[PDB]
């Protein structure tokens, strides 16, 4: 191990894996997650050949692009859960801009007071399809990044 | 403070009228059916007592409100069904026809139709 | 007009709180982080990017 | 706490008003929560509930003076601990109806 950064291993093996340099970080100690920097591609293989052999039956490895699978579900939520909450924002700025004998005369009255609120100011749907518009930008970046894993 | 946020301005303004009408709608049965005491057919002099008048302008103000957000013949239909249906509080009943003649536009013709139904 | 944009305000508030519940479960590790998830939030998302953003 | 570690409010975890930035907060929590083996959301769901019964206890519906300026300060903060997904909702609705009264 290395002190300094005690997250790194250096193999000293004094074969063909010399300077091969590895890290492991166990999260759920069933799952883990291993980064071989290796001196080429060649030496990458024969790493996980030696490594699927020493490992329980039904160790299921996976490489990984674009970072743990955990990672990318968070972020794909994040995303949405904004998304989600802009397109509310939408709706209740709307609903704001909407609300901005002698019985029979107050009647007919409230019944017009309650006719007014069938429509919406298109500039402000506008302004708010344009923040929204930023997050499916960033969800949608999320999504390929998910959909390749 | 109830009957101020019942009153459906703040309230037919948000909310689409589909589900507002079945919450009136039950509203009024559960107005009419709950608690059916004075279920004597002798309430005949306690009419002048739910006289429009002397009825509580609460009741009047709720009927006006429940009046607005729907319409007669719907209500006038949905009544002959209720009365038809199940037990009344006339009190409820009584002060609701004196409030509905008055407010809705001459349903008194429309009343006198299931009358001659009945 | 208004019934429209309710329609859809309250089919994004049905699948808002379905997503704040799954990360509250993500949260506790109730069910797992694995998959199914991945697989259920990559189904809202096909669901949205239909008739994504008319713009009138 | 009081087992794992010998004899809770973010004094606890800030240690005696050390400071109020979000992210010195944030690493407090991860601390408590990597000693006690408990996810942050928890401790987090915990520590504000508890701190909202202070707030809303010491002096009737309303509450419109400085417990709001508080208040929203508190909430500003549980907004970020939301985005950065450090708390649970449901273990602190649970932890809110355990308090039941004090709230208004």
Redesign the interface.
């Known amino acids: 191990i290395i002190k300094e950064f005690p997250e790194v291993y250096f193999c000293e093996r004094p074969g063909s894996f010399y300077g091969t340099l590895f890290t492991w970080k166990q999260r759920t100690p069933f799952e883990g997650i291993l980064i071989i920097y290796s001196r080429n591609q060649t030496v990458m293989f024969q790493c996980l050949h030696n490594l699927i052999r020493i490992l329980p039956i039904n160790c299921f490895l996976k490489n990984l692009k674009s970072g743990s699978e955990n990672f990318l579900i968070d972020n794909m939520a994040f995303t949405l859960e904004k998304e989600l909450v802009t397109l509310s924002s939408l709706s209740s700025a709307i609903a704001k801009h909407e609300s901005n004998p002698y019985r029979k005369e107050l009647q007919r009255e409230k019944k017009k007071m309650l006719q007014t609120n069938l429509k919406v100011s298109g500039a402000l749907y506008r302004e708010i399809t344009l923040k929204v518009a930023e997050v499916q930008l960033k969800s949608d970046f999320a999504a390929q990044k998910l959909s390749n894993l | 403070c109830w009957f101020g946020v019942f009153s459906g301005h703040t309230l037919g303004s948000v909310i689409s009228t589909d589900p507002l009408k079945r919450f009136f709608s039950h509203t009024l049965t559960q107005i009419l059916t709950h608690s059916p005491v004075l279920k004597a057919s002798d309430a005949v002099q306690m009419q002048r007592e739910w006289s429009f008048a002397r009825t509580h302008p609460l009741l009047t103000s709720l009927y006006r409100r429940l009046f607005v957000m729907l319409s007669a013949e719907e209500l006038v239909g949905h009544l002959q069904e209720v009365l038809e249906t199940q037990e009344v509080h006339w009190q409820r009943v009584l002060s609701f026809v004196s409030a509905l003649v008055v407010c809705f536009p001459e349903a008194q013709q429309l009343l006198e139709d299931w009358v001659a139904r009945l | ?3 429209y ?2 329609q ?2 309250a089919n ?2 049905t ?2 709180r379905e ?6 479960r ?4 109730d069910e797992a ?3 199914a ?2 697989q259920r ?2 189904q ?2 096909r669901q ?2 239909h008739p ?2 008319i ?2 | 706490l009081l087992e794992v570690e010998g004899p809770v409010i973010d004094c606890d975890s800030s240690e005696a008003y050390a400071n109020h930035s979000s992210s010195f907060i944030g690493s407090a929590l991860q601390d408590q929560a990597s000693r006690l083996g408990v996810p942050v959301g928890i401790l987090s769901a915990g520590m504000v509930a508890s701190s909202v019964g202070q707030i809303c206890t010491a002096p009737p519906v309303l509450l419109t003076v400085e417990q709001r300026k508080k208040l929203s300060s508190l909430l500003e903060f549980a907004q970020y601990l939301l985005a950065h997904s450090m708390f649970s909702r449901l273990s602190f609705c649970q932890e809110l109806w355990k308090i039941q009264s004090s709230l208004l």
């Open positions: 007009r208004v019934q944009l309710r859809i305000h994004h508030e699948l808002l997503v704040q519940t799954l990360r509250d993500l949260c506790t590790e982080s694995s998959c998830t991945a939030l990559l809202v998302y949205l990017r994504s953003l713009l009138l």
